[PDB]
Curated annotation (Swiss-Prot), chain A:
Highest rank taxon of the organism: Eukaryota
Record flagged with keyword Cytoplasm: no
Cystine connections: none
Role: Involved in nucleolar processing of pre-18S ribosomal RNA.
Family (UniProt): Belongs to the UTP11 family.
UniProt keywords, alphabetically: Nucleus, Ribonucleoprotein, Ribosome biogenesis, rRNA processing
Subunit structure: Component of the ribosomal small subunit (SSU) processome composed of at least 40 protein subunits and snoRNA U3. Interacts with snoRNA U3. Interacts with EBP2, FAF1, MPP10, RPS16A and RRP14.
Gene: UTP11
GO BP, one annotated term: translation
Cellular component annotations (GO), alphabetically ordered: nucleolus; nucleoplasm; small-subunit processome; sno(s)RNA-containing ribonucleoprotein complex
Source organism: Saccharomyces cerevisiae (strain ATCC 204508 / S288c) (Baker's yeast)
Compartment(s) of residence: Nucleus, Nucleolus
Keyword match Secreted: no
Protein name, entry field: U3 small nucleolar RNA-associated protein 11
Curated annotation (Swiss-Prot), chain B:
Top-level taxon of origin: Eukaryota
WD-type repeats, residues: 1-27, 35-71, 76-111, 113-154, 156-194
Whole-protein coverage range: 471 to 752 of 939
Protein name, UniProt field: U3 small nucleolar RNA-associated protein 21
Miscellaneous section: Present with 2020 molecules/cell in log phase SD medium.
Curated annotation (Swiss-Prot), chain C:
Per UniProt, location of the Glycyl lysine isopeptide (Lys-Gly) (interchain with G-Cter in ubiquitin) cross-link in this chain: K28, K45, K57
Function (record text): Component of the ribosome, a large ribonucleoprotein complex responsible for the synthesis of proteins in the cell. The small ribosomal subunit (SSU) binds messenger RNAs (mRNAs) and translates the encoded message by selecting cognate aminoacyl-transfer RNA (tRNA) molecules. The large subunit (LSU) contains the ribosomal catalytic site termed the peptidyl transferase center (PTC), which catalyzes the formation of peptide bonds, thereby polymerizing the amino acids delivered by tRNAs into a polypeptide chain.
One GO term describing the cellular component: cytosol
Compartment list: Cytoplasm
Residues found modified as Phosphoserine: S32, S59, S74
Gene expressing this chain: RPS16A
The protein, known as: Small ribosomal subunit protein uS9A
From Swiss-Prot, chain E:
GN (gene name): IMP4
Superkingdom assignment: Eukaryota
A Pfam family: Brix
Effect of R212A: Loss of RNA binding
GO cellular component entries: 90S preribosome; Mpp10 complex; nucleolus; nucleoplasm; small-subunit processome
UniProt keyword annotation of Nucleus present: yes
Protein name in UniProt: U3 small nucleolar ribonucleoprotein protein IMP4
Listed result of changing R111A: No effect on RNA binding
Function: Required for the early cleavages at sites A0, A1 and A2 during 18S ribosomal pre-RNA processing.
Cell location: Nucleus, Nucleolus
Biological process per Gene Ontology, one example term: maturation of SSU-rRNA
Domain Brix: 78-259
RNA sequence: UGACGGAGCCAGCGAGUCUAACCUUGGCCGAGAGGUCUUGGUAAUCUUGUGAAACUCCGUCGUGCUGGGGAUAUUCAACGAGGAAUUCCUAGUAAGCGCAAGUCAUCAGCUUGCGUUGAUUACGUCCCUGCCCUUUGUACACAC
RNA sequence: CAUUGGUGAGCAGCGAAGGAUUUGGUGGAUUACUAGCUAAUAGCAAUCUAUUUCAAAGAAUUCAAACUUGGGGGAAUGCCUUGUUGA
RNA sequence: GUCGACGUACUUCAUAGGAUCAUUUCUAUAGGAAUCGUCACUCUUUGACUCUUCAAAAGAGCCACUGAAUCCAACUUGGUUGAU
């Protein structure tokens, strides 16, 4: 892993770096809910659940 | 530069906006009656304003100072700034055209001859002439080097607008009647016209000086011809030996 | 949804991220205001991006700076660099380019280390 | 390699030791040392010219050395490279001193003031930054990427507004008074600025040929069809003979040689700009040729503090009344070429030095540059040399303490002395000596 | 030049892996070369492969300093930095002075607040070739590390019987002429590797009458380093001792610069193995 | 070995040296068709100058300078993915 | 440039189921091994992450050195920035400051890292002390 | 306590018989404007035909023509060139 | 410390029976099986076509006229005797 960090090549574009994002310290945010769900649900969904 | 636009209001105040973002940048308050002409240098360094109280203000533009203020003898109706030669012309109310440079702030020509209010005027693109048009149904051309009127056209409709092309190709006038734009071509783009005044040293009238053949009999003087004739004469053997082809042609 | 701009200011190991966006005019370093940035003798080192160009540039935008790393003087140099080049980048992107390079000219006439750090060193003689 | 322009011989050839290809050079003023930089080596190669050896390899850039220039006065080397860094090397005399100035983006075309005080670099952002050399801090920059005409190519599928192909200058050059910069790049605009005010003086469209590629910013939408544009269709087999039905263009070739071997239209670009050292012009190496742009004083009435009493009529009255100095300064305030020529020829030889000593100092570069551009082709050789002798004797200390004002008016004068007058003097000298031989010696049998 | 040097080291170790992988074809091409030379029959494995012989038609025209030093061996003079550990004592600063006087084309760099990554980067883009980092123990210098910079090797040594020229007497000034070298019984391939490392930090081609000499004499993995000047008499040659003497022992030799310690080790001292003290250049 | 001059010289080797394949091996695009689309859209410069056609052959020393143009949306989104985007230098 | 007494604050290294005292006083259980509880003394760069110190602020003092047996419920060792000489040193450098680690050699009577704060003076010269090089210009013009 | 995150409920402000977003089609520009057709010194354009035919001119031993082939090896039968036998 | 002889030890090398395919019929064998001018239906495989996801990127650009779709406001209708 240290060698891969030495050979990152910073001109590395993927299409998944639109959806995936990064916290303040620089590490990877992994959403602990789903990735087939949504974490925030809409107002009418909240109306039905409540 | 295209960055700045200048508004001159009828209460005498120049406001300077940015053309990209549309907001007020500066606001000069010199005049008290209506500001009828604003222009600026080709280097965005000195601006010149003229109001119909008859004062031309000269401001520095980068610093917001004024460099000076010059009081003319009539209310000024229109300014045109020739930007390469830094000479701007004012149509005064006393039916004269005051040509004044912005560097040293002097009246450098004053053109008289119009009988009614000057509707429009414009500089030649080389800045040698100024063509004006006025309510006496006339269009005049002034050679501001010599300061006199080169040509005059009595045109039946009063010409309300006069503009030169930014090359020396065309004059465009606009009259009181007629929905179009009248277009003239200057014949002095193809020939040379005499700067000799109309009313109602031929080389100096045609702006030339044919250089005389020798200035003094005790002065050495080369030939009137190409400079290379001496070298051609002195080395025409080796030049032709150079110029021969590398092998003999097949006859 | 808002016009916003992010810049970075660095000295030795301090680093400061400045987010500039349109707002009411509040300048906040690490949550606290800019008028609390210790060691209090270099508070004018932090202030000079504001006083060099006037507060009328900051009257319509709100800046926030997050500063980690470094020491006291490296953090005030990171703060002033982040504020300066963030104001320049905001006036580039959302205000006119004439005010952009007027700001660049003013900061560069004061010191261009407000905008470009001195980064890779030494010299092997 | 070095070329004698007398005997037409390549007398010197300098190679490195690493087999690299050189992209820019810079010579000493006192031409002991040549210097050259590559785009694949990150070093600068320093050769002596007297001997042929490799004197040094300067190292310290971490990117390909895009441009080199020696300061013409204090002889300090300035290199600038794609690691976003301009660097100043004190080579001569025990220093081995290096001063690196960082800059915002990667540099292509550094240029150097004629007095060696400042250096102007062009960057890939689109800017021209100007730095003080001795105190390595930026004096001022021009933001040039919005007065650049970048046309749209035929093959590309992105507009000329959003293109990043040519919105920067790959070649810049100082004027010889140090006050202006001409600049060109891979675009069809060349722009010149005045570096005190950092404002665009004028922009020149270097081509309107639609046969070149990057000329039009907006391409005619009639030519864009349901499958491709109609100008990317090769109609080369509709040709009358085989030698232009032939396609011998190997595929991914850009900037090789032999225009047949590239398959695209030739793009429009300026590869080098330079100002003229003697007369108020610049040359630009475009794709169409060496475009030479020059002013001329025959047109453009541009006076210098005339008043209402300053007139061609007034000037010839002062000439006829033979106030010769007043006629000369009236013609200078008119700044009219025919009037200056008329007064200049009407002043007699008896009082050239009185007039030339009483010329005011603001009209000195005007009379010097007039005498240069007149005397190159005028026949009055002794008259022009009398005027040059009177001006250099009467006011030749003002010239020496204001070098860069008369730096292009004095180079135009010694373009007249060594190029027509010295050739004539050589001919009369050879005639004198052949006479002395042909009558002084013994021809008997 | 970051990306160039990374991909250049990548291509070099790719080529080295490809050489050790396809080095069997070199020796079996050698077998069929000498089979053509003396007309002896060819083995079954080299006799039934048809592709190798129709490559041998092409390959019949095929045919000291090693891969890191081979490109610029005698072409270019070295450039050495000598630096101490960090916050050094005065006797280590005297020793670093003595080592920078030992090696010509060496300068000395003050060490303090220099991180070893950006120190290595500053050296290998300013164009230096070797770095000598010296470590002490209460004055007594205990280690020196030599790093050859265009991704070359680092040899780490300990120093053992150190007597210093600053410590002895005012015996005068040094010579600083390009010396002659002496290497005594460096016999193994590690011995030739250490010789090439230790001697490509001297200038190529001294004078034939260059009157100072410096010897690296191996005595059971303890390289005695002495430096002598000489003047040849009528009966022998008279040796005077000048400059520091020590014994260096190689304990590590790896294949990268100083910064990483992720480099592949070519050799390092197995101390606690069962047959440790039984062989030399172990 | 010189048998490379008959065996290993090959249109696929000259084609692996093309610009989109260099790109895809440098991880600069996820596939060769994506690399073709990106350098057709004018995102990729070698050195300073923008390269516009796919067939461009990239030598060994000239593949160190294959980057994106500045003011690229792709450069902006990779910098803002790692939120190292500094808007001072436009990306 | 101090001494007390509070307060604000700012790092970068470092993550092996691995990291860590000694000597006693006694009670109870047990066949014994021992277990568990209890107890005083000595030693200590603590223990894995949070945190540094120099620094900054706020109250208070007020600048002429050290000894044991004697004597009530004074006087007999060193030392207040270190002589002659001597060594090293040119920018994130000298120096101040703390914090971690402990990597097959070396080191814990310490060694190596890591950040924090950060200058003065040279940046010329061969005059002195030395060391080196050359003494046909060769290499192709021009010039010397 | 931050969201410089999504979804909503609302104010202030802006605010002329409404506002916003998206999209299909057509027309005009995207180079500098001398008119359509044909068998063209003129006809036609409502039509070329029942004059559209004759005459003249007009034919290189160039009776030569792949400047057009991915590399190595070969070419039974072809094909090319040269000679040859028989007519 | 070098190379020969002897001795020792080690490595490698066999290639036979039968079937099938390979000749625009026929691989040499009679022990084998195939010669038909289309009508329809069902199931299956594939490729385009349009739209789209991972998942973006770039828009042959401007202006006018005309049609459409959606979200608000406004009006109308149904609606706590019950809308969603």
């Amino acid at each position: 892993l240290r060698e891969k960090a030495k050979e990152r090549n910073p001109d590395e574009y993927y299409h998944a770096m639109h959806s995936r994002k990064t916290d303040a310290k620089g590490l990877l945010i992994s959403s602990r809910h789903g990735d087939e769900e949504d974490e925030s649900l809409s107002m009418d969904q909240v109306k039905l659940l409540k | 530069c295209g960055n700045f636009g200048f508004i001159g209001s009828s209460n005498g105040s120049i406001t300077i906006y940015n053309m990209q973002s549309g907001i007020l940048r500066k606001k000069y308050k010199l005049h008290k009656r209506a500001v009828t002409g604003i222009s600026l240098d080709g280097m965005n360094r000195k601006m010149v304003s003229c109001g119909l109280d008859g004062i031309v203000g000269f401001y520095d533009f980068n610093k917001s100072t004024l460099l000076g203020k010059l009081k003319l003898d009539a209310p000024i109706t229109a300014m045109v700034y020739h930007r390469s030669s830094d000479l701007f012309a004012l149509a005064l109310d006393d039916l004269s055209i005051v040509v004044i440079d912005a560097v040293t702030q002097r009246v450098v020509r004053q053109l008289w001859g119009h009988s009614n209010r000057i509707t429009a005027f414009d500089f030649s693109p080389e800045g040698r002439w100024i063509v004006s048009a006025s309510l006496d149904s006339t269009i005049r051309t002034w050679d501001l080097p010599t300061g006199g009127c080169i040509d005059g056209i009595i045109v039946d409709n009063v010409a309300t607008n006069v503009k030169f092309s930014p090359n020396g190709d065309l004059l465009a006038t606009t009259h009181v009647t007629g929905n179009g734009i009248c277009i003239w071509t200057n014949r002095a783009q193809f020939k040379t016209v005499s700067t000799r005044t109309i009313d109602e040293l031929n080389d100096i009238d045609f702006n030339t000086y044919t250089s005389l053949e020798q200035i003094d009999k005790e002065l050495l003087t080369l030939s009137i011809g190409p400079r290379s004739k001496m070298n051609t004469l002195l080395h025409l053997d080796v030049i032709r030996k150079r110029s021969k082809p590398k092998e003999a042609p097949k006859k | 949804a808002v016009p916003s701009v992010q810049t970075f200011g660095k000295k030795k190991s301090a680093t400061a991220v400045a987010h500039v966006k349109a707002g009411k005019g509040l300048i906040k370093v690490n949550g606290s205001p800019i008028t609390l940035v210790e060691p209090e003798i270099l508070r004018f080192k932090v202030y000079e991006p504001l006083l060099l160009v006037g507060l009328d540039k900051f009257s319509n935008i709100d800046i926030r700076v997050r500063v980690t790393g470094g020491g006291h003087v490296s953090q005030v140099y990171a703060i002033r660099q982040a504020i300066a080049k963030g104001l320049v980048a905001y006036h580039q992107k959302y205000v006119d380019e004439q005010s952009k390079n007027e700001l660049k000219k003013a900061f560069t006439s004061y010191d261009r280390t407000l905008l470009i750090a001195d980064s890779r060193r030494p010299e092997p003689k | 390699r070095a070329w004698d322009l007398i005997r037409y011989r390549n007398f010197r050839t300098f190679t490195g030791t690493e087999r690299i290809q050189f992209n820019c050079l810079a010579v000493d003023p006192s031409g002991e040392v040549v210097c050259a930089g590559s785009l694949d080596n990150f070093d600068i190669h320093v050769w002596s010219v007297q001997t042929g050896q490799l004197l040094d390899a300067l190292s310290g850039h971490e990117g390909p050395v895009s441009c080199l220039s020696f300061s013409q006065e204090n002889s300090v080397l300035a290199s600038a490279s794609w690691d976003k860094t301009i660097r100043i090397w004190s080579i001569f005399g025990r220093s081995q001193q290096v001063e690196p100035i960082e800059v915002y983006s990667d540099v292509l075309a550094l240029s150097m003031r004629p007095d060696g005080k400042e250096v102007a670099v062009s960057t890939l952002k689109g800017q021209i930054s100007i730095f003080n050399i001795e105190d390595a801090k930026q004096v001022g920059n021009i933001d040039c990427r919005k007065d650049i005409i970048s046309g749209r190519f035929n093959q590309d599928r992105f507009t000329a507004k959003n293109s990043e192909r040519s919105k920067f200058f790959t070649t810049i050059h100082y004027s010889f008074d140090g006050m202006a910069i001409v600049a060109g790049g891979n675009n069809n605009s060349i722009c010149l600025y005045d570096v005190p005010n950092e404002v665009l003086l004028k922009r020149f469209i270097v081509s309107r040929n639609m046969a070149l590629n990057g000329t039009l910013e907006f391409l005619n939408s009639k030519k864009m069809t349901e499958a491709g544009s109609l100008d990317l269709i090769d109609d080369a087999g509709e040709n009358s003979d085989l030698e232009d039905r032939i396609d011998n263009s190997l595929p991914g070739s850009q900037r090789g040689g032999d225009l047949s071997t590239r398959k695209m239209r030739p793009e429009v670009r300026v590869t080098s700009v330079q100002f003229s050292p003697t007369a108020n012009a610049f040359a630009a190496a475009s794709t169409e040729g060496l475009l030479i742009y020059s002013t001329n004083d025959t047109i453009l009435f541009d006076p210098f503090d005339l008043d209402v009493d300053v007139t061609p009529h007034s000037t010839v009255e002062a000439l006829r009344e033979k106030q010769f100095l007043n006629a000369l300064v009236m013609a200078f305030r008119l700044n009219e070429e025919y009037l200056i020529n008329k007064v200049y020829e009407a002043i007699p030889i008896k009082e050239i030095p009185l007039v030339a000593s009483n010329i005011p100092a603001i009209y000195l570069p005007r009379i010097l540059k007039f005498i240069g551009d007149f005397a190159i082709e005028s026949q009055h050789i002794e008259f022009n040399l009398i005027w040059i002798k009177a001006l250099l004797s009467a006011s030749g200390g003002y010239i020496n303490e204001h070098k860069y004002l008369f730096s292009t008016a004095m180079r135009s004068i010694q373009r007249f002395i060594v190029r027509v007058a010295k050739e004539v003097v050589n001919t009369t000298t050879d005639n004198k000596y052949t006479y002395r031989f042909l009558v002084s010696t013994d021809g008997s049998m | 030049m970051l990306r160039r040097q990374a991909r250049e080291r990548r291509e070099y170790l790719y080529r080295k892996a490809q050489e050790l992988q396809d080095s069997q074809l070199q020796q079996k091409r050698q077998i069929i070369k000498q089979a053509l030379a003396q007309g002896k029959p060819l083995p079954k494995e080299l006799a039934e492969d048809e592709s190798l012989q129709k490559d041998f038609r092409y390959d019949q025209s095929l045919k000291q300093v090693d891969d890191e030093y081979a490109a610029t061996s005698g072409i270019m003079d070295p450039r050495i930095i000598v630096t101490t550990s960090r916050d050094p004592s005065t006797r280590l600063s005297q020793f670093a002075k003595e080592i920078k006087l030992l090696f010509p084309n060496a300068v000395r760099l003050n060490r303090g607040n220099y991180v070893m990554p950006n120190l290595v980067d500053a050296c290998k883009k300013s164009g230096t070739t070797d770095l000598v980092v010296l470590h002490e123990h209460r004055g007594v210098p205990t280690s020196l590390t030599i790093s050859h910079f265009p991704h070359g090797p680092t040899a780490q040594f300990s120093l053992h019987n150190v007597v210093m020229r600053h410590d002895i007497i005012n015996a005068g000034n040094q010579s600083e002429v390009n010396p002659h070298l002496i290497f005594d019984n460096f016999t193994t391939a590690l011995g030739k590797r250490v010789v090439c490392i230790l001697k490509h930090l001297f200038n190529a081609g001294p004078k034939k009458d260059s009157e100072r000499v410096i010897t690296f004499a191996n005595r059971g993995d303890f390289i005695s380093v002495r430096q002598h000047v000489y003047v040849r008499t009528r009966e022998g040659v008279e040796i005077a001792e000048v400059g520091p003497r020590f014994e260096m022992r190689l304990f590590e030799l790896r294949l990268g610069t100083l910064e990483n310690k992720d480099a592949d080790v070519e050799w390092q001292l197995r101390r606690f193995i069962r047959t440790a003290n039984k062989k030399d250049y172990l | 070995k010189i048998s490379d001059l008959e065996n290993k010289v090959t249109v696929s080797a000259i084609c692996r040296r093309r610009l989109p394949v260099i790109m895809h091996r440098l991880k600069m695009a996820e596939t060769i068709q994506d690399a073709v689309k990106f350098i057709e859209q004018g995102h990729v410069r070698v050195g300073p100058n923008l390269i516009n056609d796919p067939a461009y052959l990239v030598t060994r020393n000239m593949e160190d300078y294959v980057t994106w143009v500045d003011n690229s949306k792709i450069k902006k989104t990779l910098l803002r993915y790692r939120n190292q985007i500094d808007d001072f230098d436009f990306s």
